[PDB]
Amino acid sequence: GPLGSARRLYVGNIPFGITEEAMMDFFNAQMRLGGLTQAPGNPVLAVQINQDKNFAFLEFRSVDETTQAMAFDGIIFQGQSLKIRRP
Ligand SMILES: [Zn+2]
Ligand SMILES: [Zn+2]
Numbered sequence: 001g002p003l004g005s006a007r008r009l010y011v012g013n014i015p016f017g018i019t020e021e022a023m024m025d026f027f028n029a030q031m032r033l034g035g036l037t038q039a040p041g042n043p044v045l046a047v048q049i050n051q052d053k054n055f056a057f058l059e060f061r062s063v064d065e066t067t068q069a070m071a072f073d074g075i076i077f078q079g080q081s082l083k084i085r086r087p
């Protein structure tokens with residue numbers, strides 16, 4: 001991509017009551033700690049949490065970073081195993 005869909009991932013099984021910001025911050029921090037970025041700055045632009053099917057869509061600033069974040073399928077966040085997939 002992109003294609004705009006090439007900059008988004010589905011993330012399932014998110015902790016009930018989590019906020020957009022908390023999710024964004026966690027992915028940003030964790031992706032950076034893990035070296036999943038090659039460019040300076042934060043990969044995640046936005047998080048849209050669905051009405052509440054316990055899922056969200058993450059939007060990334062780049063197609064590369066979106067791809068790298070696939071590595072985080074099954075990452076534990078606030079006691080939950082996140083399910084990460086292409087949309
Ligand atoms: Zn923050
Ligand atoms: Zn929002």
